[PDB]
Structures are given as C-alpha cells and as structure tokens.
Amino acid sequence: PGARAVVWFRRDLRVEDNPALAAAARAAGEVVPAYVWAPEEDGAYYPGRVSRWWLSQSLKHLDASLRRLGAARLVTRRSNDAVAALLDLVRCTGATHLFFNHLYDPLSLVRDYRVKEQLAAEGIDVQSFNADLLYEPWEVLDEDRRPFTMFAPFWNRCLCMPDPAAPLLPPKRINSGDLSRCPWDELVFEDESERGSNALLARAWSPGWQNADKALTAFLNGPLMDYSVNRKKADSASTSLLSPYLHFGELSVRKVFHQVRMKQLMWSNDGNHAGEESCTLFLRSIGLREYSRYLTFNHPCSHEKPLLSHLRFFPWVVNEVYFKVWRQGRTGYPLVDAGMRELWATGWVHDRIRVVVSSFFVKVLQLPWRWGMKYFWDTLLDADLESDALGWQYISGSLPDGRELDRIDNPQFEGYKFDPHGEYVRRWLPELARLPTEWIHHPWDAPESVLQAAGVELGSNYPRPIVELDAANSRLQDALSEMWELEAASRA
Amino acid sequence: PGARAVVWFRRDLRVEDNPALAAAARAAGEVVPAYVWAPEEDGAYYPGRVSRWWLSQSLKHLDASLRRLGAARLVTRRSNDAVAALLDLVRCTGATHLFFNHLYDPLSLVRDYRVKEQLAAEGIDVQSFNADLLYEPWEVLDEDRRPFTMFAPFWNRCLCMPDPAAPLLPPKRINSGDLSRCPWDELVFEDESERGSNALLARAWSPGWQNADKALTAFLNGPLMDYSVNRKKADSASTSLLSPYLHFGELSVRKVFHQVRMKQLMWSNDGNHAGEESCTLFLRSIGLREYSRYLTFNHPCSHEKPLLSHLRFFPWVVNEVYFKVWRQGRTGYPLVDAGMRELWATGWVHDRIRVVVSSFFVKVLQLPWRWGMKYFWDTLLDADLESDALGWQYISGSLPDGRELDRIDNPQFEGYKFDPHGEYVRRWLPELARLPTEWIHHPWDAPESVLQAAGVELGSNYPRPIVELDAANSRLQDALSEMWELEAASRA
Amino acid sequence: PGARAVVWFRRDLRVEDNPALAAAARAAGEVVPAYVWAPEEDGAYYPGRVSRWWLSQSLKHLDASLRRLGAARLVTRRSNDAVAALLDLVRCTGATHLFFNHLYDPLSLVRDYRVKEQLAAEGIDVQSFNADLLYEPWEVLDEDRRPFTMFAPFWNRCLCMPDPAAPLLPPKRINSGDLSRCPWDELVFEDESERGSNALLARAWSPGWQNADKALTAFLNGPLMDYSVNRKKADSASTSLLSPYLHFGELSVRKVFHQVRMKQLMWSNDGNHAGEESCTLFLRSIGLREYSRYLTFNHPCSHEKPLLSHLRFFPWVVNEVYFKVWRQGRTGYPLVDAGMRELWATGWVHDRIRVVVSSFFVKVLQLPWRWGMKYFWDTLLDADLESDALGWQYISGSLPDGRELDRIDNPQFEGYKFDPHGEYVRRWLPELARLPTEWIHHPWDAPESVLQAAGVELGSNYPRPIVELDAANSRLQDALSEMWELEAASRA
Amino acid sequence: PGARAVVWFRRDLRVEDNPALAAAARAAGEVVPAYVWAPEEDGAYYPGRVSRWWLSQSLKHLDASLRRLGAARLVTRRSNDAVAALLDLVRCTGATHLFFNHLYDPLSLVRDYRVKEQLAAEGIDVQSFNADLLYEPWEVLDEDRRPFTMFAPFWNRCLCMPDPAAPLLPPKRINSGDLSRCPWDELVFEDESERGSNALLARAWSPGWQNADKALTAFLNGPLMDYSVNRKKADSASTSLLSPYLHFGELSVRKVFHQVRMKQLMWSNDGNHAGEESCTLFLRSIGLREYSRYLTFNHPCSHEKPLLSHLRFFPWVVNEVYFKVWRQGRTGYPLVDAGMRELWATGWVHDRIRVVVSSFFVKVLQLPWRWGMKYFWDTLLDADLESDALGWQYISGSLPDGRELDRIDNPQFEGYKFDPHGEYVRRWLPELARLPTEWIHHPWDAPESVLQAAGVELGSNYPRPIVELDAANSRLQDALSEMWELEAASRA
Numbered sequence A, B, C, D: 001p002g003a004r005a006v007v008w009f010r011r012d013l014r015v016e017d018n019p020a021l022a023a024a025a026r027a028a029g030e031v032v033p034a035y036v037w038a039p040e041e042d043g044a045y046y047p048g049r050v051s052r053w054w055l056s057q058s059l060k061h062l063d064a065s066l067r068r069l070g071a072a073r074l075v076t077r078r079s080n081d082a083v084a085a086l087l088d089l090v091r092c093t094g095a096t097h098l099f100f101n102h103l104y105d106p107l108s109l110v111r112d113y114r115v116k117e118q119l120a121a122e123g124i125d126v127q128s129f130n131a132d133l134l135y136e137p138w139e140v141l142d143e144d145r146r147p148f149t150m151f152a153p154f155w156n157r158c159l160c161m162p163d164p165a166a167p168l169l170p171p172k173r174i175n176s177g178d179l180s181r182c183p184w185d186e187l188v189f190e191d192e193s194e195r196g197s198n199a200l201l202a203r204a205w206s207p208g209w210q211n212a213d214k215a216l217t218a219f220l221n222g223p224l225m226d227y228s229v230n231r232k233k234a235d236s237a238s239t240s241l242l243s244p245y246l247h248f249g250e251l252s253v254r255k256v257f258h259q260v261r262m263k264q265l266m267w268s269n270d271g272n273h274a275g276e277e278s279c280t281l282f283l284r285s286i287g288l289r290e291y292s293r294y295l296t297f298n299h300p301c302s303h304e305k306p307l308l309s310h311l312r313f314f315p316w317v318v319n320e321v322y323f324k325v326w327r328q329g330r331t332g333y334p335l336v337d338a339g340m341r342e343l344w345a346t347g348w349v350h351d352r353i354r355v356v357v358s359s360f361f362v363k364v365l366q367l368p369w370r371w372g373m374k375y376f377w378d379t380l381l382d383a384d385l386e387s388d389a390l391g392w393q394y395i396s397g398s399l400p401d402g403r404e405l406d407r408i409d410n411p412q413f414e415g416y417k418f419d420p421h422g423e424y425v426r427r428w429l430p431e432l433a434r435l436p437t438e439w440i441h442h443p444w445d446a447p448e449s450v451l452q453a454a455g456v457e458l459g460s461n462y463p464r465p466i467v468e469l470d471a472a473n474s475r476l477q478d479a480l481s482e483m484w485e486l487e488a489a490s491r492a
C-alpha cells in the first residue's frame, strides 16, 4: 500500500500468469504498467518488418486489456537508451519498485543487469522472475553438474524432473496512479509504405493476449488428438499454430503444459490410446523451445563466436539473384515454392517445410546463411532469434543431433512425407494445380508429354529449376571438402 | 525411494490435485493406496441408502483409474475399528509413511487425531493436508482474531484474500509394492434387495473421478454464461449439477475456482458484461460450501448442543402418516410434490426447490426436523452432513441470515419465482399435466369448473391438500408463541 | 376471367397441391375461399373437444396464409344448414363456380350430392376432385371387378399399380373480389371454460398448413432411416408424428409419397440397405389410411349396420367408475397408464400403445366400446372417424386380419416389445419411476420386498390393479361363449 | 408385356423423371438401356477434353445405377454411324420399340429425324419426349404467333404461363432381357496421356446421377437464401454450382423448378422477405438456359450463318502467343488471371467472371472469338454449345440485350462488383497475395513504392500487363469503325 510499483514487460504481453503483475500488486497497491521502445540500442538487429506488425497489435490488445483490468493506460515511452527510460519513468511515476520479467536472449542478457546495477544504485528495488520459460535453464543439470550437448537427455531428465508451476490467476483488478500525463509517446512500428499491405496478416492470424488464450483452447479439442500421426503432414491444420502467440508470451507456456498434461490424463482413462502418445509428443515439441532457451543461455552465441562458426571456412557463391528467386515462388522446386509463397503471403509456414526451404538455402543454393536468417527474421511473426537460431543450427550440420550437412534431401519423397496427396502445393502454387501428384514435386523429371497433359510448360507457367539439382549435390560435396581441407590447414 | 508410503482417502476420490497422492510419491517411491469401511464406528449415523450407491461406483472408478496410473489395486479393508486397520495395513504393506487428507466433519474430527496419536506412538509419520476445501477454516479471521456469525462478510473478506492454490497435476504414474495379497475384503455398500432398483440413478447421474472432470468442463461452455439470470429457475438445466461430484471430492474445488475465474477473465475482455456477473455469482455459490465447512469447524455441532437447539422447546405433531405422504408425491402441493417425486426418482433436486420442500416439512407439516434430515441423508447423492446441516439451519429460523421461521411461503408466487411457465411440475407431475399454469401450483384455489376443464378431480388424480394451508399458518404462529412462551419460562 | 369462382374446404386445409384451389384460379380469375361451420347438422356426432382446438388454429393459419397468397380473407359463415350456406354465399359473393374437395366419410358422403343437386338446380357448376387420398377407393379393384376383404392384397395390388399424381405446386398468387363484407361470422370452436387448459397442446404440437410441411421434411432427414427397426418402440421419437397434420389435409398425402419414394431411391444407390426396407415399411403405414378410406367407402358403416355389429350379442358391464379409472392414469397397469396419462396430457399416443389401451378397454374392462370411441374422438387431435373406426375394428376381433378377440395380451412382454428398457413408463408415470424394469409393467407380480426397494406401495403411490388380470381373462372367455351361444340362438 | 423396348439417352443421364424410361417400361415389360458413341459423325466438333472426363464418369454412375434398378447393364456400342447402331441394336436386342429423349442442338436436330425416318421405315415405333427443358421452345409464342428477340418478355410471359410438369418418380425396378452378350464395346473417352492429370477434377467436382440430386438438395438449405445479394460475388460459394449436372441432365430441370418454387412458398409464409426475392432470381437464372434452347431452336445457328455473323467484317490480330498467355494465368490482369487459373485448374468458373475473361478475349486481345470458344468447349465441364453459344453472343455486341461491344470494362470496379475484398484473386493468384486490395486488380496503376511494400515486382512475380489497357481501348474503337466502315461498303 506504500507506493506505486511499476512493471515493464517486453516479451510477456499477457495479464494472466505474469509474475511481474503478481509482484507489483503484491508489494505496492498502486501499479502502473509500461513498455519501452529503444530499438537503435536494442542493437543490430531490429525486430523484422512483420514481427513489428504483430507487436503493435499486441500492445493495442494489451493497452485496452490493461485498461479494463485497471484503468491506467499502457504507457509508451521511446528513448535512445532503455536504462535511461525507467529512470525517466520512476521519477515521473513517483515509484519505488520496478518489477519485470526475465529474457534469456543475448541482446538483453546484459541489459537486465545494467537495468539492475544502474537502478539499484538509485535504491529502487529492481526485481524480476520467470514467466517466459518452463524449466529455468539454470535449473537443469547433467549427472554431476555439467551441461547437455544434445536434446535427447535434456528432455529425458526434464520429464522425471518435478512438475513446473501451475499458472497464476490474473490479479482481480488493478489501478494506476496519476497517468500524470507523464510519457505518452505514440510508437512507430511500421513504415508508412507497408501499412496497408501488412494487414492481410490479420486475415490468417489474429494477435492478442486474449486471442492467444483461445488459440490454444481450440487446439486441444480438435487438432491435438490426431496430432501424433499428422504432425509431419503439412497439408492440413495438423499443428497448434501457436508459436508467435508463445513467442511474445501472450500464451503462458505453463498454462499450456498444465492443459496438455490434463488432456493426456483424461484420454488415458478414456481409453484413447493414441491421445496419450499424441499428447506426449506435443509436449516434446514444446520442449524444443525450452532447449532453445537453454542453448543460448549455455553457449556464448554472441560476438563474435557465431552460432555457425564451423562453416566459417565454407565457400558459397555470393549471388544476389539466386537469393531473389528464393525470396519468391520461382525456384523451380514446388515444395520450396509453396512454402516460399506462404511465408511471404502469411508470415508462417509449417515447421517441417521450414527445413525444406531453409535447407534448400544453404544446401543447393549454397548461399550465405546470414541472408536466410534476415529474411526469416524480417518476414516471420513467430521470430525469436533464440529458437530460430536453433532451427538454423539443426538444419545445417551443427547440432550433434541435427541432420547431416553433407546430404541433400531428394524432394520427391521428402514431399511425400510432408504433402502426401500433394495439396499443399496447389493451394499456393496453382500454376501447376493440375499435373498429377506422382511428380508434382518433380516437374522436371516427369515426361514432356505429361507436362502437356497438365499444361505446365516450364518457362511459361512454373519456371525451370534454378541449379538443376544433380550438380549442386556434386558441388556441395566438393564445397564440404574444401571446408574439411582448409580447417585442417588452419589447425596448424 | 526408501520405503512404501501409503495414502488412505475417504472423501477425496480423485487422482488429480490430491496432495496425499503428491506426498506419498514424494517421500516414498513405492505408493500403495487404500480405503477402509468401518461404518459401525463411523458412528450413528451411517451414510444413506444412495450415498452408498454412489460411493461404491466411485471406488470402482477409483480402483480401475488407480490401477491404470499405477498397477496396484485399490485395497479394500473393512474392520470394526478404523484406527486398528491402518495398523493392520502398515505391517501388512510394510510401510513407514501414511498420508491422507483432512476432513472437517465432527464424526471424523476426532478420528484423525486418534489416527495420529495411535499412529505416532508407532513411529509412523502420519501427515495429511488440504484438498477438500478452498480457504482453510482456520485461515480466515474477523478484524481482530474472531469468527463470522453471518455469510456476508466471510465471503466479502475471502474475496480480497489471496488467490488459493492452483490445482496440482496428477502424478506421472505410480506403483504398488506387493499387493501382498494382503487385505482384499470385498465391500458391501447396498443391501441385496435394493440393488436393481438403485441403478436408475445411473440413467440421470454418472459418478466417477473422470465423469466429474467433464461434469464441470461441460458446464462452463454451456449453462455457466446465462446462469446469473436463471440460477433461480428450476425448470431447466440452470445449474452446475456438480454437487455430489464435489461432495466426495471427485472434482477439485480449486480446479473449479481456477477455471471459473478464468472464464470470467475471458468474458470481461470479450465484452460479455453478463458473463462476469454470472461468473461471480457462481463463485459465491461455491463459497456457500466453504462457509459450511467453516461453521461446523467453528461451532460445536456435536453431542449434544444440536444445530437446531433453539427449536428445542417447539411443539410439533409426531404424526407418522403426514410424513409418509410427504415422503412421496401426495401432499397436495405440486411444487413440493414434483420435488418429492424427483428426489426419490433421481437423488437430486434443485437447491431452491429443496427449500420449498424442506420448509414445507418444518413449517406446515410441523413435523420433527430430524425426520426430514434422515430422509435427505438417506435419499440424496450429494449428502454431506456439513452443507446439509447448513441448509437445514438457513431454512428454519436459525442462521441470522437464514429466512424467517415465522413466515410460511405462499406457494403460488414462490412457484412463479422458481417455475414460471410451470413445466417443472408436469415433467414429474403429469396427473395435472393439463391444468393451465395460472394455478398449477394452486389447484385448490382455482375454480371447480376449471379443474374439470383440465381433468384434475382432487381425490382421483392429484390428492386434496394435506392440512389446508391457512390453518397451519395460523398454528405455526401459536406454535412459535409457545416456543417464545416456554423459553422465557426456563430462562428462570 | 369471367367471374369469381369460390372454393370451400373442410378437411383439406392447405394451399399446396389443392386441386380445388387449382381449379378455381383456372376457370375464374377471381377466387374467394370459404369454410362453413354447421355442426348441429353435421350430425351426431361432433368433432371432439381437441379436434376443435386444432381446427381453430389451422383456420387461423389458413386465413393468414390465404390472405398472403391473395388478400381476401378466409370467409367464415356459420349456419344451421350447410347446403343453405353456399347459396347464401354464391349470391353474396356474386359467383358462378363452386369447387371443393371430396370427403369419403359417411356423414358427408350424402352431403356432397345434396350440395350438388341443390346447387346444380341453381345452374352453378359444382365440381370437386381428389386431394385427400392417394388411390381413389373406386380406382382399385379385385381380379374380376370385386372388393378386398383384407389389407394384404389391397396394398400388394396398389404397389404394382401406377404411380399416383405428383403434387401440384401452389398457385402463384390469388385474389378476392369484394370481401363485400358479406358473411364474417366469427366462429366458436371451444367452450370458454377449457380455453386456457387447452393450449398446452401447443407445447407438444404445433398445427398449421406450414407447420405440417416441415413436420414431414424434418422426419425424412432424421427418424425415417432407422424406422424399420424402431416403429414398434414407443420410448423414442420413432415415428412420423404426422397424423393430425395428415388428417386435416395440411400435409399432402402424395407430397409425402413422392418424397418418401425419392428417399428410398437415394438410399438404394447410397448402398443403405436398411433405408429401403425402412422406407417401404413407412409407405405401407400410409397405405393403412388409404385402406381406411376404402373400407368406409366399401362397406356401409352407417345407420345402423354398425362397424362392430358382431359384438351385438356381447354382454359387458355398464360400469361408469371402471371407465373413469380408465379415463385417467389409475388402472394399475403401467403401460396402459402412461398411455392414458399422455393421451389426455397431449392428445397423441403411439399407435402400438393405442392398441394396448384400446384393447384393455374392450378386453379386460369388458366395457361398451362406444364409450372408448367417444373419448378417443373427444381427446385426440388426429381423430378421423374413418381411420379411428378402422383401428377399433382391427383391435377387437372384426377385421379378418385384426388380432384375436379371444386373446388378452399379457402386459409384461407386450411391454418389452413396445418399451424395452421401460422409459416410456417413467416419463409419464414417475410415481414408480424407480422400481427396476424387470417388472415395471407388472408391479403386482413382483415381490413385496422389491416394491419397497423402490417405494411403490400400491394404494399410496400407484394404485392396485383394477380387475386383477386373471379373472377378466377367465370372464372374457365366458363372455365370448355367450356371444357364440346367443348368435346361434338367433340364427333361428 | 409384349416385347423388349429399348431407351437410348445422350444428355439425360438420370433415372428419375426420365420420360423415356417411363415410356419403355410402360409399353414393353422388358427394357434394356443403351448409349452410343459415334463421335466422328457426331460432327466437328467433338465434346472437349474434360466434357469427356465427366461423361465417362456419369456413364459409370449410370451403369451401376441402372444395374441396381434393373440388372442388365448399360450397353455401350461405338460405331461410325449412329443411325446404323440402333439398327445393329434392335435386331441384336430383339426389340420392337425404341424410345429416347429430345435434344435441341443443331448437330442432333437432324439426327433425331433420320433416327426416325430410317427407323420408321423398319416399322420400329421410334418415339421421344421432353426431359431436357422446362418450357418446350415451340410451346411459347409472341402475342400473335411470332418469336422473341430479347430475354425480357420471353420470361415475363413464361412466368404467367402454366406450371410445368412435376417430376415423374423413377420406375420401381426394371429388367433386361438377354444382355445377349450382344454389343459390349468398352468406350474410349480420354487419351491415355491425360488420364492421371484429369482426375483432380474429382477433387472439386463429383459427377453422377446421384451426386447431382444432392448437389441441389444441399444448395436449397444453404446458399439459396442469401443468393439474391451475393449472386454477383465470386469470392464465395454464392451460386448453385449445379450447371454441368444440369447440362448432362443428371439433375431434372423441373425437379429443381418444383423444389425452388416450394422453398419460395415456405419462405413467404415464413416471413422471410428476402428468400422470395432470392428465390425468384434463381428461377430467372434457370430461365436463361430455357431461352438458350429457345434461341438455337429459333434461329439457324448452323452452317454457315454463324452466331456472330455481325463481326464478320471485323479485323482482329491472328496472334498465337497472345492467346497462349490468355490460355494461362499470365495476362497481367488479376481478375482475368484468377479466372484463367481456375478454369484450367478445375473446369468451372463463376458466371460473372466468365464474362470478364471472355470479354477480355474479344475486347482487349482482339483475337478471333472462335479461339475462345474452343478452349471453353475443351476445358469446361458445363459445356453445352447451346448455352455457351448464348454466353458468347450476350458478351460481344450481338444480343439486343447483351452488353455493348464498344465498351471495354474497366477492371478496377468491375472487380469490386465481383470480388469486393479481393480474396478471389489470392486464392488462385497468391503471387500477389499481399498487395492491398485497393489495387489488387490494378497492379500497374498503383505506385512503385507500394508494389515493393507487397513484393510484386511485375516481371518477376506477376507479369506486366499484355497490351497496356489504354491502347487496346483506343484500337477497338478504330476496329469497330472499320466494321461499320466496311459493312456499309458491302451493303452495296
């Protein structure tokens, strides 16, 4: 009751199960809540074109959700320096207590300490807890006090760890203080050119604290049960579609764990024997994110010692027109192309068809992986540098469990794994909507009298394949050899 | 991992959010679970005819749910002495740790201590926690350290108390020990005469750990939202139908609180302004049970100083044929009679039409309230002596907030409150299915040429009213006067 | 275009597939439509208490349906003489052409001729066609030019007869003439006492031209398919519920034949092999009505030579209290009693449980069948003297295919045929809602310690059986013997 | 019963409401049914690539539907001469009576007479009736005995004509004769190259006698009611999707008229005031087909005096690469291009977006209309030369009510009429899935900094517009002038 504590959140835009919210209305009795936007010294790089578009709309949905729970306001202050914003706030607000939530990424790994040291020097009682992750990366260890180099045992230990915390209920209702009229900077998240041509994201995606709580609750009832068989299939709504919601924290990662585990229970005693297997498998898929946070917290992943050091001595072509063809739906490889048409039509693509397009980048285009990550970063809603780094490691050699860099997936039966009747291609790629599915991911291989049976005439409708696959798969093996050849040269 | 702890539950038949289960598989690594049946020295009285029928079926649904989570068995041991059964068990099981769950009733208020003292003397580490109640009755107090004499402020304080514990998730999976073959007594819950004629309960009710978890989850989606308006209406599925499930603990009382409070959240930001009011009102209705546990823990309610002391000097007629007519659907009062036909057809009746039949017992029949409670006890599934005592206090004078003993409700517009179009009567009472609803709860008052317009001919179809209301409502006031007259006589 | 023809309908209240409507707006170009109410010389007897209640509401639904198709009015004229009403109309209307629809019953068999002879004498061109029946009773004959004495071959011939006429579409839209203000008598259909206590019929039934068109269309989709198995079961919505609609003509009897036969088609090629059998069986059930019209047209059934001549020399008890117990739910026989509670609660009962109550009248009560028919006539909505005569013949000896008069059905497994789990009894008869279903139709036979297991105490709840079955089944056989004994006496 | 009559159908593949079927099992008592395939002297031209694919599958669905109704067989005989096939049949079958159904097209206008003259000379009683059309083209006339030159009054008269015949019910069940083993030629409908790449038609369309009966019955319940507003909108399932079914006769054109008109009735009395307007409007849309049959029966439309005589002296460019771009989705005009991607992906496109692509052919490509019709003929399922001629007349000058040839529709607000939010484009044309809908049908006009806001880069993704619209709309007006200029030259 003493003063007005304040919470400042960045990737925990939710009012349910927000320890920071449950801490501020737990010492103080006046709680004003804030978000800051110092992007320049958020450091290169930024959040990307669409990761903004989402972020703006979440805030709106946080502001008018916040306002309802307790009429202040979401107080928007933009500055050159983050640390020197909460100081701008704390005098402004007239507050003695700043509470927020942890963030594990490198770019804000150090920021929190220097929002602690600079703030503790002003006797301000900065404190922050854990709502973004399920098992705190420093909470899990390795037989005697070491780390995990693979996924397998990190999860297998986590499984018979204890149960992680049930989600806290929201506060009853909260209240401001003087919205003095202290710091109302309206925020700029999108450039004015791509305002209109952004919003079609809203036709396929609907961001928000609320909208994410039902994003999950409508997954459990439906797509969950027959998920174990279909998680690989990309031609249907086979997956949670819940990842940007979980990126920004709009959905509590242990709300879900509680709910999933519950459904498993009911299904077991229901006698549904494939609901449990489906239900365990999902949990592992959430575990992948938990490991992502673990790996960046465990390994440097900062400046320089890069994530993909070990391709340092790799020779790839710096070709800026191959990349543009990749950027769009014109490579020649339909699986890659449907994915590529969807990413940039809608801002999300199935996991398994991320690998096929992201492998295709490094593997057969032999182009600098930095280029891919930026486009990914720029054009994805569910972009965390953390799990999207992990996804670039897995896919290209690195991770001891990640798949073989030396092997180029053959699209025809990597396409039967992920699109068996071939109707993923042909919701995005109707140019070839009619060529039968034997070789819908092949069109080159298939005979020239069948192409005409279904009006694909590569070079009018659907373009001939960039880099005819055989001779990149040669040249990767030579390229890998120079890697091996010149890493032992500078092992001297 | 050291030995085999054991849990013994009585009114907490559930595997989710069972601290006892989460305690035994938390010291020990072998967990066998048990239930005992010493009814003779469970003390007069028993659990009643149907409260058994439910109990048997729950166990079955606990045994084969227990078995699946971890194949032992539900170990059934019947004895003359309860205390001397766990000793029979602990040697048998070869166990060092007995954990169970609290029960607040008087009949087992003392038992737990003497399952502690006798068990602590054998160095056995008896311990037990809180899963049956939401706010522990000793956790709430009164300004300076006193108690609550009404409902109003007990809840109003509880509301801005803290949030009560989120429900614990079930254990992953558990395991026996040697089901030596140590104590398998098969249990007798129903007499063999009323076996067949019991089970129609199963057509309207379906007991079980599981069945209760979906009893709730199908309430939230449907009847919850438009509950604030309809909680009084008894002609539709206006209520949770969730009370026997919550009596035996099959549904966690703070599973529900979490879920309710959540729905309130989503509805508030949904803009549904009547979902919140509906959602708060339900919560109070759960609060009524919490107060029930509070009142019995607070006030003696034991041997003798009875719950309804203050009718001690009341003169009622000991008439055993009035009671039999009450027992069935033949009183003459249709509201009372539909309720009475339903209680004994199905084992549950709406709250608000419990008061009309339970008032009718004390008020116009002027019959010994003990008689009512036993039938209630004998014929209800959702029978706890605790809340069903509280419901007999409220209804007859006692509780400072309970309604006036001196006033006899007039059935005609107490029937419009609770059955406005009159279709509760006429699902149970079709003898008069056709007399229009102006006076469907009246039939006496209504004119003798209308009775014939709808073929009620009181004394063939639907019997003339026992004790024509006017002259019991006289005689209660005289009866109350002798109470007042002879309580001041023995205030000498 | 010449003048204003007029249509007058009595048991064809519908605007679709009404040849009379399609004839008047086919010579004339002005069409006014009318209904008359001469009940006194409609002849004893009347239409019964509820057959009115329906009739009033149909007219209302014809008047405002008529008005919409073409704003006149339904013109209501009540008179002592029917014939002298259309003369009152024709001058009034200023009309040259009166068209209506055939009615096959005896009471209006002669009326139509003397609405022809008296009207043809005034040079008025009376004409009328066929919309009430499917195969015109004079259209079907017997090998060489004879009649049918059983059902079996009447239908078997009708089956490979030709297809009967598809239903005509309604007129586009029609128009009056001067609603001069010529004959507006408002009509009296119900006595003012039983106005209010009639309408609960509206809760279970909803009469009307329109409401009947969807009464059918919602039958085909649902209850039709699994009708072949369930037509006998009375515990569910196993049947069309379409008979009063079809009595008054609100549903075209060959609209349905077309629709049924269509569904059979689609199901056959659907591969549904039980939809065809179900679909044929329904058709026979409609055939029963067609035969009814045939039998009254074929056999005198008029004044006197009564339908049940051959029980003329039968001795039954004239007891007016047995009949009153029958009238209500108090006989002692639950199957009979549920039916009896439903008839008079709602105005319709399943066919198969009509026989059990209507047999019970003649067979074990041995009471004058006239008494039953009047109550049936008075309390049924789907009352045509035509098919409800046929149903009294079939059930009591007469019809060569009707079941044996000498045999009294034993209620226990006539009740398993028609109510196998026993939940028909116990939606209407909840007094015994709890006694298990082994002997729910028996209660006498079942042991006195089970009655108490389920609180039936015959003589408080559910009354002991009138005429304990054995000794009526004796006495029918003696009664039948005196019939046989004294028919051969007056074969002298 | 005398002999085996035979029916031969060509564009009436249905067993319900097939007068030919109802005629053969009405003189004869043995009925064998047949279809012939003489395509060479069916005359140029053929039926097109997909009109076959449908036709094969219908037969299959007729053969095994025929077989079930009555086990013969559909007897498939292919010949050089049609007339000399039924002679091959009639001896073969040993039959005296050949009945079929009328076809109004020119190519078989004469065939029927010379399947009559050659067959009547062999004393064979050829006869055939009317099942393909609703009002027989010789049944409607013009004030005094003339014809109709516009649609408007042809329908307005037809409306207050009489009601056309209700649909006949199928036969009960029929039977062969000796399937001697007389003429079983298996039929070739598709070339073996385009077998596989044809069938995806089956994913969007499902042909068949049966499948068409439910194609309609699921239209009435849903899309019918809100059809009056949405018939123009092409972005949803706004229309019957019932036209190929109605082309081949699989759906009876007066089954539907009956059903539609019925729904109108129920909606009127339902009070739905927009169901009637919607229901009338559909009927007119069926009327368009009726007029089509009328126009070809009325006007020569044969050899030579072509349908589009009056563009005889029109100069268009014979350019075979403009046409190929049209053939596919690459014109530059998104509305045109989505349509063009759908036609050839799926074999059907909305009516209103047929005009925009078919106008675009004649109007801005200024290419020979013959070229369009063949592709239409080749790639449509719902291809009748009859109504698809009429649709080419209407769209290009001809029909006195058809729209102005001189005016080129401006795509931007012809696209708001037909695709208001722009989601038709972007189910077929996702290359531009993201450019906002202000100018999704414009992409040229819209500014070069917005193209980049949504990654359209015309010349990588979605190609720059063939013939930049302005200067075809110039050149049509010059082209029209030479028409006018050189028709008056040869009016000399």
Ligand SMILES: Cc1cc2nc3c(=O)[nH]c(=O)nc-3n(C[C@H](O)[C@H](O)[C@H](O)COP(=O)(O)OP(=O)(O)OC[C@H]3O[C@@H](n4cnc5c(N)ncnc54)[C@H](O)[C@@H]3O)c2cc1C
Pocket (backbone or CB within 6 Å): B239, B240, B241, B242, B243, B244, B246, B247, B285, B286, B288, B289, B292, B349, B350, B351, B352, B354, B355, B358, B380, B382, B383, B384, B385, B387, B388, B389, B390, B391, B392, B394, B395
């Ligand atoms: C004469 C009388 C007798 C009663 N006997 C019992 C009994 O034997 N067992 C029992 O659980 N409740 C009893 N109650 C309380 C209340 O009527 C029942 O909880 C109600 O019948 C349950 O219906 P429900 O499932 O729709 O509860 P809901 O309205 O759906 O809400 C669920 C919770 O409401 C609680 N509740 C609501 N009202 C009360 C109340 N007055 N007192 C205590 N709890 C309340 C119940 O514990 C229940 O768990 C009695 C009330 C009266 C007036």
